[PDB]
Every structure is written in structure tokens, then in C-alpha cells.
Design brief:
Length: 167
Amino acid sequence: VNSFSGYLKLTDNVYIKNADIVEEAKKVKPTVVVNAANVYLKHGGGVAGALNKATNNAMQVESDDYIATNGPLKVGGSCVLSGHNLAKHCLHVVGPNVNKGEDIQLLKSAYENFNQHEVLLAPLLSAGIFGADPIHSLRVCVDTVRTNVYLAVFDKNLYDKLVSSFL
Ligand SMILES: O=C(Nc1ccc(C(=O)N[C@@H]2c3cccc(O)c3C[C@@H]2C(=O)O)cn1)NC1CC1
């Protein structure tokens, strides 16, 4: 049993809710919150901008030190950093950004990072300002992630479309 509330169950291991991932993280304090990161960990907008703002920019400060030491992530890759006031840990995962021309097949590799964590709160990778079709992202999630994932979808209209079209 865990503290995630109000989710619709899609499969054995994937759950979904119309929720602001920032507000959900503040309330559950999950072991892992996933950030929709880019390779530079520049958290300017979308989910990343919102999570970073909620940390009062501490996420960005930590991220800048990470990049200065390690260099950029790979598209499809990830790193574990602090969850600050939102979670124990933040798993920064880089999905492909269609608006940069990145190969959508890398979306499966991106979701594979979730399998290193038993339970996660997450957004749909490559959705929103990353330009991919969220319905496709949900399908890849369900067909790739085997650990327990709680997906937060900010837009109510999109959430309803995601549920109603889910196979
Ligand atoms: O700003 C706050 N939260 C958030 C959460 C998600 C996002 C975000 O870009 N979502 C993506 C998005 C945006 C518009 C339409 C969409 O189809 C999507 C899919 C993405 C998602 O839903 O994952 C931005 N901001 N919280 C402050 C405390 C009030």
C-alpha cells in the first residue's frame, strides 16, 4: 500500500491522474519524482520549470554543479539528484524533444530509466513542450515500465482523452 490517491488504474503497474505534479509531489513526498529534463538540466519551462520554481531554484543550482562536473546527459538518459522539498530524489530523465528533431525511438530508452526505481511519480515523457504525441508516450510507458508508476497529467482535457483512448 502507498499514499497515492485518486488514480485510475490503467494496468498492473501504471496509474494515471489529472493533477499538477508539483502539487502532487508536495502532498505525497514520494521517494522519486521524475523531471522532464533536457541534457543541460536547464529547467526553464514545462514540467522542469515548474518543479524548479517550486524548489526556489535549488534544483537549478544543484543541476548546474552536476553539469559542471559530469557534462551533459544523453537523450534517453537520466541522473538521480535531490528531490529538495518535493521528494526524496528527483530522477531527471531526458526524453527526445521533437521540436529539436530528436529520434522518437529514444522515448523507450528514456522510460527504461524508470525501471531502476520501484515506485515513481512522473509526467508523460516527451509530452507538452517536448512535442511528442502524449497518447504515444502513454503507450510506450505502459509497454516499457515494469515498476509502479503514478502519472500526473496537468491538462484535464488531455487526461480525459488519454483515458478514453487507452487500449
Ligand atoms: O506549474 C505547475 N505545474 C506544472 C505541471 C506540469 C506542467 C507541464 O508542462 N505539463 C505538460 C503539459 C502542459 C500543457 C499541456 C499538456 O498537454 C502538457 C503535458 C505535460 C504534462 O501534463 O505532464 C507545467 N506546470 N505548478 C505550480 C504550483 C502551481
